Each structure stands twice: as C-alpha cells, then as structure tokens.
UniProtKB/Swiss-Prot annotation:
Lineage: Eukaryota, Sar, Alveolata, Apicomplexa, Aconoidasida
Activity control: Inhibited by 1,10-phenanthroline, EDTA and bestatin. Inhibited by (Benzyl)Tyr-Ala (BTA). Activity is not affected by phosphoramidin, PMSF, leupeptin, iodoacetamide or pepstatin.
Annotated site (Important for substrate specificity): 264
GN (gene name): M1AAP
Subunit description: Heterodimer of the p68 form and the p35 form which are derived from the p120 precursor.
pH dependence of activity: Optimum pH is 7-7.5. Active from pH 5 to 9. Has less than 20% of normal activity at pH 6.0.
Source organism per UniProt: Plasmodium falciparum (isolate 3D7)
Main subcellular location: cytoplasm
Name of the featured protein: Aminopeptidase N
The protein's enzyme class: hydrolase
Residues forming the catalytic site: 302
UniProt-recorded Gene Ontology molecular function terms: aminopeptidase activity; dipeptidase activity; metalloaminopeptidase activity; zinc ion binding
Part of the intact protein present: 196 to 1084 of 1085
EC annotation from Swiss-Prot or TrEMBL: 3.4.11.-
C-alpha cells in the first residue's frame, strides 16, 4: 500500500480541459465512452501519462483517434493505465476510451451502481476512476458534457450536472439525454442518476438578484409522499445562507435525490445532491422524530457545500477539513437557528465529547489535517468533520458575528473559483482579527496548531478571591498528552467564553468576555468583583477541550440551577455525575477485586437530587434540557476517564446511581410523564406535512426518557402506561413502547405488533431493527439470530446491516460479555461485509475503537478478533489498513 504524504503535493504535468461522456446503460452492463481534451502543463517533464482507473474492462483506448496497442504503447493493471511517454503528444490532444462496468453487481456503492431500481453514481473521493479513466484528484478541473442513454421504461428520468440540452429517442425502446455543464469542476462532483423517479418541486426566488431557482426532490414512486419536509428544509437552507452569509444559489435548478443503498448520509455533486433515503425521507406516520432534525441537517449540509466545497475547491484531500469542518460549522449554525432549542448545540457537544474524544485518545488519533493517508475512504472521520467544525466555530467565537462574517466574505470573495488550503482560511480570519483588534501586528499564526496538532487539550482552573480588594483571579493551565504524532505538544490558542455568577441572586457580574489563553498558563484578574463569584466556564463549549472546572458540587449545583448558559448548566450536571461515577466505580471495583462479603457505596448527593427535582418541576424550564439532566453521561464519554475499564463494573455503577435517583424521584417522573402527554402527543398538525415543532418533539423525548427510567425501575403498574403508549400514532412513542417493554413479559407481543406497523416502509423497518437491536434483553443473542433469519437475511443494504448490529454494540453488559461472543459476532459481520462493501465493514469496526481502554481480559478478547480479521486472506485494503492502525501494528 502506497502512503500519500501531505508534504509531497505537486501539480499534475497534464491538463484535462474537457470531458465528453456517453454512458450507455444496458441490463447486463454499462458501456462508458469518454473523450478527454487534454494538454501538457507547465509542470510536465516528459513523464508517462498515468490515469486512474479501477475495475474497468477496456474495449479500446486511443490518442487523437488512433487506437493504442496494449503491451507496446500502454499497460493496465486494473488500477493505473500507463501510456508510455513516447506515445503521448506534446501539445493539445484528445484521449478517448471505451470501457465496460457493471453497476448491477457493484455492491461497494462507490462509482456507478444500482440501488434497487435506480442507477446512481458516488464519486467522492476516488469513485470517478471506477467509472472511466481520469487523473482522479480534486485539483484537475474540467468542463463536462454528459450523455446518458437507457431503457425508457426502466429509466424514464435521467439526470446529471448542468443544463439538460437534448433528449432523444433511441431504437429498441431506449432514450437519451445530454447535459452540459460549462463551469469547471473536479471529477468528484460529477454525478448521474437514472431511474423511475417521482418528484415534488417548488420555485425559489433569490433575495438579491431575484433569480428563479427550480427545486426538485426525487424518490422512487412508493415513497414520494415523504419528500415534503426535505423540500421545506432546502428552502430554509437557501434563506439561511442568504440571511447569515449573503450568499445566493448560482444555478437555475437544484435536484435532491433519495436512494435506498448509500454508504453515508449524502453527497454534494453540483446541482445534483444524492442522499441516503434515511436522510431525505420522512412522514409523521412512518418516521421517528429524529428523522426531522436529521433531514434538516443533511439537506442544509449538502446545500452549504455549494460554496464551501463546490465554488471554493480543495487543492488536495489533506485539506478535507477545510470543506467538511467548515460546512459542518455552517450546518450547525443553521440547525441551531432553525430549531431554536438549546439541545441542538448540546447534542453536537455530546457527540464530540463521546465519539470524537474517544477517537482522539485512540491509536487512530490524527489532527484535523493529517500528514499522510493510505486509504481516502477512511479519512472521513469525526475528527476531520466534528473537531474541524469546532475549530471553524472557534473563529466565530474569537471574532464575533460582524468580524467573523467579514472574514468569511474575505475568504469567499478571494478564493471563489480557485482551490484553497487551510492557511488561506486562516489568513482570511486573521485579516478580520487585525480589523477587530485594530492593529496589524496581531496575527493568528499560533491558531494553525489546531490544524496540525492531534489529541484533546486539557484545560484546568484554580481561583482566588480577595474580599477586601474585590479582586477575583482565574488561573488557567492547558496540557495536551503527547501521542504518536507529536512527542512535544505546543500550547494552543484557546478562547474561553466566561461569565461570573453571583451565588446570592444568580446574576451576571461581568459583561460577555472571552479569555484568549495563548500560553501554557495564564492568570486572568478581574477588579470590582463585589462578592466571590461562581465562574461559568467555556460557555457554549467554546473550545474542543477536556474541562477541569475544579468546582465543588455545591458550586456546580448553583450553576445548574442559576447560570444563563445551557452548556455550562449541562456540563456542571455532567461533572457532578462523573465525580459520582468514578467514586462508585472504584468502590465496586475494590469489592470485586478483594472478593468482599460486604462493603459500602457512597450515595448520590442529596442536594444534587433536589436540584434535579427543582428543574423538572419548573413549568418554564425546557423539556429537552430536562431530558439531558436525568440521563447519565454516555458510556463512551465515561471511558475517557477510567483506565482498564471493566464494563461490568461500569454497568453496576450506572445501575446504582440510576436507582439512587429513581428511589427519590420516580413519583416526580411519573407525574410529569402524565402531565406532558397532552402537549407532547398533540395531533393538531399530524396531517400537516410541513409543520415541524422541535419543542414538541423535545417533550416526546422527555416523556420517552422518563418512561424508560420508570420501566427499568419496575414502577408500580407502569406496564399499563407502556401498553397505552404502544397505541400512539407517533413512531417515536410506539417504538419506545417496544424497548421499554423489554423488562416485561409483554415484550414479544409488542415486538410483533410493532414489526407489523413497520414492515411495509423500508425506513421504518430499519428503525424497528435498531429498536430491537438496542432492546435491553437477556435473550438479546437469540433475538439477533431471529432478526438475521427472519428480516435481515442476505441484505447488502448498509442501512439494514448497520440497523441490526450497531445499536446492539452499545449494550454495555451484553455486547461486552466476558466470553467474547459479542466481539466474535461483530467480527464475523465485519468480515462478511468486507467481501462486498469495505467502507461499511470499516464502519462496523467502531466498537473496537476503544479496545485498548478496557480491562485486560476484554483488551485481549477484542485484539484476538481484530487479529483474526487481519488474517483473512481476502481482506480489503481498506479494512486491513484500518485494523493495522487500530491495533498498533
Ligand atoms: N467517501 C465517502 N463515503 C463520502 C464522503 C463525503 C461525502 C460528502 N463530502 P458529505 O460531507 O456527506 O457532504 C460523500 C461521500
Ligand atoms: Mg436576595
Ligand atoms: Mg430493501
Ligand atoms: Zn460534507
């Protein structure tokens, strides 16, 4: 396997100016004819002309309409086509080829492939070379002219980029359409779609130039009534980009297309965005609530790429975070603004601190701009995306909205229509930073360490208050643990949004303030502080760091009750829970280790319990927020703080803490579950396809969270509530009725009822699978085997595979069974999957990312499975490289 290093970037010694494609789709094969109008660049040195091309069957290749001779004038090895330089022209020339590919049997879902009865392409990052020969890298910009032909009755709708310029009948019941797209683009943005597609459409008129834009959303006929919310989300996305950024869509049409088989959420391809059906389609009847926010965020994300990926391009794939982390940042601003709920930002933080922190302390840790890769298919990571988004969001925290907007415009204005690197972004923010600080000595040079340095910084605090002097000091330290990528870690530029809360009346004591920590430590002093404050630190989660607030639980309770910032309130709660978790974990571990016949557990802080009750009972507090405070921190967040974590001891710790709080609050939880029903389950708008109320869905999350707490606690007669819940029209409710019924004899009756409600909608059935897979069942292994035999079977749909096995891997007691049978089961599924879809096989490795953080027995069991997979003679390059890096080989 070749290793690509970021420092080795050099421009191609060739130019491709024009691509002209003819893609002829037949039932047993697709013939692709391509003519590339090419040139020799100023960088050329008489080298062999080398095209990427993977899995292609050559019929013929030519230069200048002269057929080339295999062996004598070219070699092809199923990966690279080499045309020896003696046969390569020295001025403008045409390369042409005709190859055969087979989308029908393309189950890896990259290149051209068939999803149910739709043919669709997926080119990012290196799929275009699976379609035809090309210099398949994002700095090769070309014009595209694409003709598609196919059976008219099977494929009446043909789409590609640009303007449809011609449509034409072909003998034998076939038809064609030609699409010309004059603006330059990289090949990873080419797309083609052919299918019996149905649609909804609307016209959008842009804010400034008043241009009409036609919006089409497409799916197979069965699901066309689930397209309306996506169309609404698209309108919202366009308006947001206009409103916040002043940016208007440049083209006359935008197509969104849903397909059933897709490796990730969706893909921006210029004017032709293609989506996993689960991130485009929803209805109130056939979708769980989470689908609504998911579609808004993925539609927004792909729309925002139209500037941040599509009009300002990436020079090379090492700059991926510049398009992805910037677009996730824009997508997160948009969602926060559309949902208007504080839980939107909290949910982003929750994801970073569980999944991305776990990645950044694992053997796979990498900075958001890595120095090397082997597999581009494994470069699309929570680090590159979600820590990149926090890095891009820190610019806004530092600058504020006016100067951030100014600097963003500087970047867009200067790099619209060219490639770019992370430095150019940083330069643009710096110009805004000089303008903010009003001095041109000021720079963001140190900021660049956020791109290059791996690992999560740790930020810790000590405090001093002089009551006579009215003088308050915050002493701050930062530390990043050395790792494989830097032995010596340098201090980062860390912005710390802070408030000072008067603990007597709950009031802010200072104006908005963001501390700029730029050294390994600093002391920030504040005068005229009338009383000793409680500090509100990292408001909004203002940098991607481990926060060690060193506050007492009494101070944390005060913040939870009285602070103005949702994140700090939640983080204070989280810190109270972590202190409690680590204490009980250690008490349980000592008892197991010492084989104690009796021992004590530290109970949960009574005043913390009272503060939770105070918040739950407050009719003006937010239901979404309330759902966060009654939930312990995620298991993958906890693991960052325990060595050799024993998953059974953690499971007993959680069980103790939940029962401690439940023994005090379950009557409160019951009462709320009942009083919330009317508003949470309100049907007034159930038949209004465009009316989406995030606050109401947050009430359902709270009722469903409370119902789960009550069911695990076998609260008196709660089964009555569970059965009544099963009859709700909302799938979030009736699927919750399935999971919480696990603790009763009614489980299999609800399994059957809900299966019947789910089985005739492809996506709802996948949600039902997830609900079953995650059910807290002692017979969970037998239940998986029933799903395999009765529902999943031989499906190669990644949504089905992931739905059956991923939720199960979060089952702390059972997935981590000490026999290793859970690790064995997932490894078998990875290996089976890897035979046809290496990308999804790698995704299914996720449970193994924390292998080296568990107790020594479980480290050994997981390592044994990883080593078994690595020994498979037929292992993909993708899977092999991932498992080699994960196991530190
Ligand atoms: N290699 C892939 N699986 C892949 C990676 C990224 C993308 C898109 N960039 P996205 O960030 O959904 O917009 C689409 C597909
Ligand atoms: Mg008072
Ligand atoms: Mg299917
Ligand atoms: Zn993206």
């Amino acid at each position: 396997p070749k290793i690509h290093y970021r420092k080795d970037y050099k421009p191609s010694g060739f130019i491709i100016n024009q691509v002209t494609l003819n893609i002829n789709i037949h039932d047993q094969e697709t013939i692709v004819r391509s003519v590339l109008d090419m040139d020799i660049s100023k960088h050329n040195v008489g080298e062999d002309l080398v095209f990427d091309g993977v899995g292609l069957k050559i019929n013929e290749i030519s230069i200048n309409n002269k057929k080339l001779v295999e062996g004598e004038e070219y070699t092809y090895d199923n990966e690279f086509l080499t045309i020896f330089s003696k046969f390569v022209p020295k001025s403008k020339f045409a390369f042409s080829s005709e190859v055969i590919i087979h989308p029908e049997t393309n189950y890896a879902l990259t290149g051209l492939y068939k999803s149910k009865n739709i043919i669709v392409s997926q080119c990012e990052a290196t799929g275009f070379r699976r379609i035809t020969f090309f210099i398949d890298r994002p700095d090769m910009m070309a014009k595209y002219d694409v003709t598609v032909t196919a059976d008219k009755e099977k494929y009446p709708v043909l789409l590609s980029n640009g303007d449809k310029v011609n449509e034409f009948e072909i003998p034998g019941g076939r038809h064609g359409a030609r699409f010309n797209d004059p603006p330059l683009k990289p090949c990873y943005l080419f797309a083609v779609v052919a299918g019996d597609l149905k649609h909804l459409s609307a016209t959008y008129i842009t804010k400034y130039t008043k241009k009409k834009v036609e919006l089409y959303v497409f799916s197979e006929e069965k699901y066309v009534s689930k397209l309306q919310w996506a169309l609404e989300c698209l309108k919202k996305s366009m308006a947001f980009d206009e409103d916040y950024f002043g940016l208007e869509y440049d083209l006359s049409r935008l197509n969104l297309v849903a397909v059933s088989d897709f490796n990730v959420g969706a893909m921006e391809n210029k004017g032709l965005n293609i989506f996993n059906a689960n991130s485009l389609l929803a209805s109130k009847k056939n979708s769980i609530d989470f689908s609504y926010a998911r579609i808004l965020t993925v539609v927004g994300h792909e729309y925002f790429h139209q500037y941040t990926g599509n009009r300002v391009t990436l020079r090379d794939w090492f700059q991926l975070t510049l398009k992805e982390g910037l677009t996730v940042h824009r997508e997160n601003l948009f969602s926060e603004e559309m949902t208007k709920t504080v839980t939107t930002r909290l949910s982003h933080v929750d994801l970073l601190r569980s999944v991305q922190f776990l990645e950044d302390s694992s053997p796979l840790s990498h900075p958001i701009r890595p120095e090397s890769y082997v597999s581009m298919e494994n470069f699309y990571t929570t680090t590159v995306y979600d820590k990149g988004s926090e890095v891009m969001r820190m610019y806004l925290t530092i600058l504020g909205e006016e100067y951030y907007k100014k600097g963003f415009d500087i970047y867009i204005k200067k790099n619209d229509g060219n490639t770019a690197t992370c430095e150019d972004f940083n330069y643009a923010m710096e110009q805004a930073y000089k303008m903010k600080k009003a001095d041109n000595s000021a720079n963001l040079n140190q900021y660049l360490l956020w791109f290059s340095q791996s690992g999560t910084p740790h930020v810790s605090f000590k405090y001093n208050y002089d009551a006579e002097k009215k003088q308050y000091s915050i002493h701050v330290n930062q530390y990043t643990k050395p790792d494989e990528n830097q032995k010596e870690k340098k201090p980062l530029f860390i912005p710390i949004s802070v408030g000072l809360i008067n603990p007597e009346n709950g009031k802010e004591m200072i104006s908005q303030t963001t501390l700029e920590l730029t050294k390994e430590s600093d002391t920030f002093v504040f005068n005229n502080i009338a009383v000793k404050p409680i500090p509100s630190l990292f408001r909004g989660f203002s940098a991607p760091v481990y926060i060690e607030d060193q506050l007492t639980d009494e101070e944390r309770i005060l913040l939870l009750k009285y602070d103005s910032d949702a994140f700090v309130r939640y983080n204070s709660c989280t810190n109270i829970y972590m202190k409690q978790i680590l204490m009980n974990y250690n008490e349980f571990l000592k008892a197991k280790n010492e084989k104690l016949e009796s021992f004590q557990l530290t109970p949960v802080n009574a005043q913390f319990i009272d503060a939770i009750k105070y918040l739950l009972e407050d009719p003006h507090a937010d239901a979404g927020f309330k759902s966060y405070i009654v939930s312990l921190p995620q298991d993958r967040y906890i693991i960052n703080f325990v060595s050799n974590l024993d998953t059974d001891v953690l499971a007993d710790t959680k069980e103790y803490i939940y029962k401690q709080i439940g023994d005090k609050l379950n009557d409160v939880y019951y009462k709320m579950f009942k009083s919330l029903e009317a508003k949470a389950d309100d049907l007034t708008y159930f038949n209004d396809e465009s009316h989406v109320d995030f606050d109401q869905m947050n009430m359902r999350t709270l009722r469903n969270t409370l119902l789960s707490l009550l069911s695990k606690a076998q609260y008196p007669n709660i089964l009555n509530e569970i059965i009544e819940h099963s009859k709700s029209p909302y799938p979030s409710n009736w699927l919750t009725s399935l999971s919480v019924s696990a603790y009763f004899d009614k489980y299999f009756e609800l399994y059957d009822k809900t299966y019947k409600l789910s089985k005739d909608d492809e996506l709802l059935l996948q949600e039902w699978l997830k609900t079953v897979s995650r059910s807290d069942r002692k017979d969970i292994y037998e239940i998986l085997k029933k799903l395999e035999n009765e529902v999943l079977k031989d499906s190669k749909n990644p949504n089905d595979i992931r739905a059956v096995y991923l939720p199960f891997t979060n089952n702390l007691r059972r997935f981590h069974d000490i026999s290793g049978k859970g690790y064995k089961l997932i490894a078998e599924v990875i290996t089976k999957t890897d035979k046809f879809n290496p990308m999804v096989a790698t995704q299914l490795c996720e449970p193994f990312k924390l292998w080296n953080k568990l107790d020594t027995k479980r480290q050994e069991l997981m390592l044994n499975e990883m080593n078994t997979m690595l020994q498979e003679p037929q292992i993909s390059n993708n899977l092999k490289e991932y498992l080699l890096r994960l196991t530190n080989k």
